[PDB]
Design a binder for these strands. Sequence first.
RNA 1: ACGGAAACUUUCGUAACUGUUUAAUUCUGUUCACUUAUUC
Length: 295
Amino acid sequence: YKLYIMTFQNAHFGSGTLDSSKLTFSADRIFSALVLESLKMGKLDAFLAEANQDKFTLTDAFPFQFGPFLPKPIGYPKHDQIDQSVDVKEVRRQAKLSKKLQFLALENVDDYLNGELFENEEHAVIDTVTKNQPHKDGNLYQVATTRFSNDTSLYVIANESDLLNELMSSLQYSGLGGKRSSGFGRFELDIQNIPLELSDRLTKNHSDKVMSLTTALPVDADLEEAMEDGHYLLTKSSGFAFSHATNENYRKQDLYKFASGSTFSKTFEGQIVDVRPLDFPHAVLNYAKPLFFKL
RNA sequence: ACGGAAACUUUCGUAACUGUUUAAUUCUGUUCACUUAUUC
């Protein structure tokens, strides 16, 4: 509906452990950031009645290098396309190149299903930095960073309103993920109006071989009915909570969701799960609002 | 209500000791203040 192009430079997005880092990040990082900063501004109760309005949703961090990128379809293609049958060694060595691929181009969303295999474009390299502490037994730690290159940018698709544009205006000067108390999260928001005439297949009604993204999460009333005959991949996303009145900061429960680009068969619903381990004066919200692409 | 929050590759240390641009070498070899001339 409306994409928000933003580029990163020397950022950090861990996945499992603080020392490790990935080029992208899950969709729950953006939703858990605007709600945390809404209380500091003075409108936490205003955004609570907006996220639960069905039409309001968010997208994952997709690369943008002279064109929007989309994840590869999980399980596609099937066992029918061999792509130039020459030898069993040449066909087997090129099948892994598509497995290590991260995102596909906007113009290759239709040619990949017909029979085409190629190596993903080199977006950025994983670089790490070292730190220590002199007045504490000389201890040290290692953390990784993400330095984009070759004009590597990202974009998130949301809904146009007169309240969301002001909440994200301060996020570019406040950090986003990783070591926020250093400067690993500052970016620049490039606002736009017209997205693209091809990337308008986002629907949530009919079910014609759709594809769920942004880590799907089925509802209790529709789990196995949409899980049978599908392609998915279980991941992992958790960590310690961040509150201001606990004196302990309890651990959030595990929420093994899916991956960006899973192909099911029917249309889900999307709910908001509440993470309450012991007791908290507030409520740890979560995204869990997957979209669908016509493919 | 962000696998996050708290954190100096920091504290220490002359690129240093030693060693003549030195030894050898005449600004000298040839050269009339000269030629003509009554203090008558």
